[PDB]
Amino acid sequence: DQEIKKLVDQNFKPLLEKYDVPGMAVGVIQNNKKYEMYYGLQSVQDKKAVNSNTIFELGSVSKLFTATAGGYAKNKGKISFDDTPGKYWKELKNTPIDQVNLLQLATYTSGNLALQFPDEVQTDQQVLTFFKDWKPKNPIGEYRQYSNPSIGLFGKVVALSMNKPFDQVLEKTIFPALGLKHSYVNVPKTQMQNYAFGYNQENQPIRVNPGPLDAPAYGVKSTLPDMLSFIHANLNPQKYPTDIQRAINETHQGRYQVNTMYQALGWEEFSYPATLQTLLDSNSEQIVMKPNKVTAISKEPSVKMYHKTGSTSGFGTYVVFIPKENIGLVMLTNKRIPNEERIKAAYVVLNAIK
Numbered sequence: 001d002q003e004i005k006k007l008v009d010q011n012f013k014p015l016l017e018k019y020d021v022p023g024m025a026v027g028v029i030q031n032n033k034k035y036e037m038y039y040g041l042q043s044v045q046d047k048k049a050v051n052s053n054t055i056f057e058l059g060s061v062s063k064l065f066t067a068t069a070g071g072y073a074k075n076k077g078k079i080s081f082d083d084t085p086g087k088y089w090k091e092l093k094n095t096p097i098d099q100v101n102l103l104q105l106a107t108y109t110s111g112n113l114a115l116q117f118p119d120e121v122q123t124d125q126q127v128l129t130f131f132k133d134w135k136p137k138n139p140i141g142e143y144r145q146y147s148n149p150s151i152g153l154f155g156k157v158v159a160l161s162m163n164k165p166f167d168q169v170l171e172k173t174i175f176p177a178l179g180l181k182h183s184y185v186n187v188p189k190t191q192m193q194n195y196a197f198g199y200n201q202e203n204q205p206i207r208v209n210p211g212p213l214d215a216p217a218y219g220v221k222s223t224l225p226d227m228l229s230f231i232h233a234n235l236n237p238q239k240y241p242t243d244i245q246r247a248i249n250e251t252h253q254g255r256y257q258v259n260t261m262y263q264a265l266g267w268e269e270f271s272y273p274a275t276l277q278t279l280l281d282s283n284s285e286q287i288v289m290k291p292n293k294v295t296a297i298s299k300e301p302s303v304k305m306y307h308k309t310g311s312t313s314g315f316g317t318y319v320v321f322i323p324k325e326n327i328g329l330v331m332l333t334n335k336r337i338p339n340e341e342r343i344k345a346a347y348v349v350l351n352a353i354k
């Protein structure tokens with residue numbers, strides 16, 4: 001359709017001037033047809049354009065891949081979401097963390113895990129020691145606190161269950177099964193020329209730094225085509241291997257609610273159609289930064305939509321999809337813009353189409 005380009009230009013393009021963003025890639029998939037819109041530069045200093053080879057950091061959108069990896073492991077019988085991490089990380093047995101189940105970790109309800117590890121935690125030993133000393137605060141399962149260490153520990157345990165380091169689970173099993181050609185935990189030499197610079201608030205060129213359990217929490221890099229294939233698989237998984245179909249399905253099941261937000265595995269779920277403010281509320285300070293007491297799902301929505309924002313210091317991402325409309329959108333920038341702007345522009349676009 002000849003209006004998709006026009007709508008993306010009206011709603012996403014103004015954001016480059018407004019936030020002084022060097023480079024953007026916006027993708028729409030509708031009725032199994034992909035549209036790729038590219039703006040500006042992957043590297044300011046090299047005068048290099050954004051294109052279908054441009055590799056961006058996904059930030060917390062990496063969590064969706066962690067969730068899928070976990071779904072895949074559940075369905076090959078390598079793990080159960082009622083398990084505890086001590087069953088795979090031997091050294092955590094019988095510590096208080098070994099009362100938390102894998103689901104509770106993946107969905108941020110351990111009752112005492114913060115957004116980030118302390119700056120001081122860096123090596124594997126410091127990570128191990130962090131979880132050994134862990135003690136509860138809220139009743140386990142009762143409180144959602146959005147957390148890198150929580151899902152990161154899930155990710156490490158999933159990898160353990162598959163006897164392979166986490167980067168190899170994604171690069172050798174999960175990415176290939178999704179048909180992705182250029183998605184990485186570690187960007188190889190051969191593709192470094194395609195890796196965008198990110199840009200901080202002082203417009204300095206930056207890329208993500210090493211950190212503890214970074215890969216499963218925020219550590220994947222991808223292109224617009226690949227992310228459009230990931231959305232397709234989410235929208236239309238029948239074409240994909242059975243294994244990966246079951247994984248995908250697992251990531252769509254809502255597990256509990258926080259007001260109008262349903263927490264699935266990695267993805268955030270809403271009743272469709274969702275009001276704009278519903279979508280904005282999921283990225284509110286109250287939801288992202290503060291603990292919130294969860295409830296069981298009462299209303300099981302009949303028609304669902306799903307989203308997830310992601311950031312690193314130099315990059316913004318947003319991904320959204322609506323199965324009932326066979327439509328989805330992906331936005332990638334090499335500078336952060338406010339989450340509310342990403343959400344609102346996608347809302348206007350996806351409603352305008354149908």
Ligand SMILES: *[B]([O])([O])[C]([N]C(=O)[C]C1=[C][C]=[C]S1)C1=[C]C(C([O])=O)=[C][C]=[C]1
Nearest residue numbers: 059060061148218309310311312313339
């Ligand atoms: B995620 O939800 O995108 C997550 N990102 C990270 O923790 C990785 C980063 C390190 C430094 C800056 S981001 C995250 C993102 C945000 C946000 O609004 O950008 C807030 C909390 C966690």
